[PDB]
Amino acid sequence: ADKELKFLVVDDFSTMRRIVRNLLKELGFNNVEEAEDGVDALNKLQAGGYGFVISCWNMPNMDGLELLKTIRADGAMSALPVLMVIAEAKKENIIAAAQAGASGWVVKPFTAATLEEKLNKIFEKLGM
Numbered sequence: 001a002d003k004e005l006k007f008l009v010v011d012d013f014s015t016m017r018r019i020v021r022n023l024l025k026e027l028g029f030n031n032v033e034e035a036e037d038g039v040d041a042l043n044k045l046q047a048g049g050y051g052f053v054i055s056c057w058n059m060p061n062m063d064g065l066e067l068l069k070t071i072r073a074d075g076a077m078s079a080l081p082v083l084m085v086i087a088e089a090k091k092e093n094i095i096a097a098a099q100a101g102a103s104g105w106v107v108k109p110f111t112a113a114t115l116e117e118k119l120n121k122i123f124e125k126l127g128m
Contacts, residue, residue: 038062
């Protein structure tokens with residue numbers, strides 16, 4: 001939709017959340033809040049108002065795969081766009097994420113150019 005759309009960036013590595021927040025800012029997305037894990041993420045999401053989730057796969061307590069499922073199973077937000085950030089281009093991971101209904105996915109480290117594209121393609125699908 002509009003670059004006002006609220007993003008939730010979830011990762012337990014503060015440095016990486018700052019990176020994605022920076023890349024998003026660079027792309028014009030200034031509505032960004034962070035979450036430090038799947039549970040924190042879910043607490044914030046149920047509080048309603050978010051339009052996009054960018055999440056790490058390898059996270060303690062509740063990984064991004066678990067977080068994505070919960071999201072997709074939640075009638076209130078089952079259609080929420082979710083971009084999965086993965087540490088490697090592993091086929092296992094990529095498929096198990098597309099399966100759980102990931103809107104898209106990227107391999108860290110990534111650039112603004114790649115993030116921009118991924119985000120565009122996704123906004124295309126969901127006609128946003």
